[PDB]
């Protein structure tokens, strides 16, 4: 499923991401835009044998099990396929654990490269939240 910008914003707000750990909703919507372009089916295979899954591109090396990543840990206790569903609950709960893993939102390289330091409030424009 491909979310509309405000549609995703509402969904995330609904799952408690707005201001979570001090990160405004805009940051989260912006991360999603550049990590997967709001596509819940998005996947990216890395060169280290791992793969990023879903709307927030969560990595299989440590956060989920896809049964084909060497020395992989499943800290979120879920199959990576669950991060490719139209319901973002799984991705959000797992994201909540990653953003609290000691690096803030820097865990998402796309967020770091395209959202960090910018006027992320714009990503929420026109939304009736």
UniProtKB/Swiss-Prot annotation:
Biological process (GO), any one: defense response to bacterium
Gene Ontology CC: cytoplasm; endoplasmic reticulum; extracellular space
Transmembrane segments: none
Active site per the UniProt annotation: 35, 52
Keywords, alphabetical: Allergen, Antimicrobial, Bacteriolytic enzyme, Disulfide bond, Glycosidase, Hydrolase, Secreted, Signal
Tissue specificity field: In the egg white and polymorphonuclear leukocytes.
Chief location category: secreted
One GO molecular-function entry: lysozyme activity
Keyword Calcium: no
Domain C-type lysozyme: residue ranges: 1-129
Residues engaged in binding substrate: 101
Database matches in Pfam families: Lys
Disulfide bonds: 6-127, 30-115, 64-80, 76-94
Subcellular location: Secreted
Catalytic reaction annotation: Hydrolysis of (1->4)-beta-linkages between N-acetylmuramic acid and N-acetyl-D-glucosamine residues in a peptidoglycan and between N-acetyl-D-glucosamine residues in chitodextrins
UniProt EC number: 3.2.1.17
Family label: Belongs to the glycosyl hydrolase 22 family.
Matching PANTHER family: LYSOZYME C
Something else known: Lysozyme C is capable of both hydrolysis and transglycosylation; it also shows a slight esterase activity. It acts rapidly on both peptide-substituted and unsubstituted peptidoglycan, and slowly on chitin oligosaccharides.
Role played: Lysozymes have primarily a bacteriolytic function; those in tissues and body fluids are associated with the monocyte-macrophage system and enhance the activity of immunoagents. Has bacteriolytic activity against M.luteus.
Quaternary assembly: Monomer.
UniProt protein name: Lysozyme C
Gene: LYZ
């Amino acid at each position: 499923k491909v979310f509309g910008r405000c549609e995703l914003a509402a969904a995330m707000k609904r799952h408690g991401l707005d201001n979570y750990r001090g990160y405004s909703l805009g940051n989260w919507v912006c991360a999603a835009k550049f990590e997967s372009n709001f596509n819940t089916q998005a996947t990216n295979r890395n060169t280290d044998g791992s793969t990023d899954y879903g709307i927030l591109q969560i990595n299989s090396r440590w956060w989920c099990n896809d049964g084909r990543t060497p020395g992989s840990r499943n800290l979120c206790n879920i199959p990576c396929s669950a991060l490719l569903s139209s319901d973002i609950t799984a991705s959000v709960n797992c994201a909540k654990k990653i953003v609290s893993d000691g690096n803030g939102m820097n865990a998402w390289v796309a967020w770091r490269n395209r959202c960090k330091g910018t006027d992320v409030q714009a990503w929420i424009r026109g939304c009736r939240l």
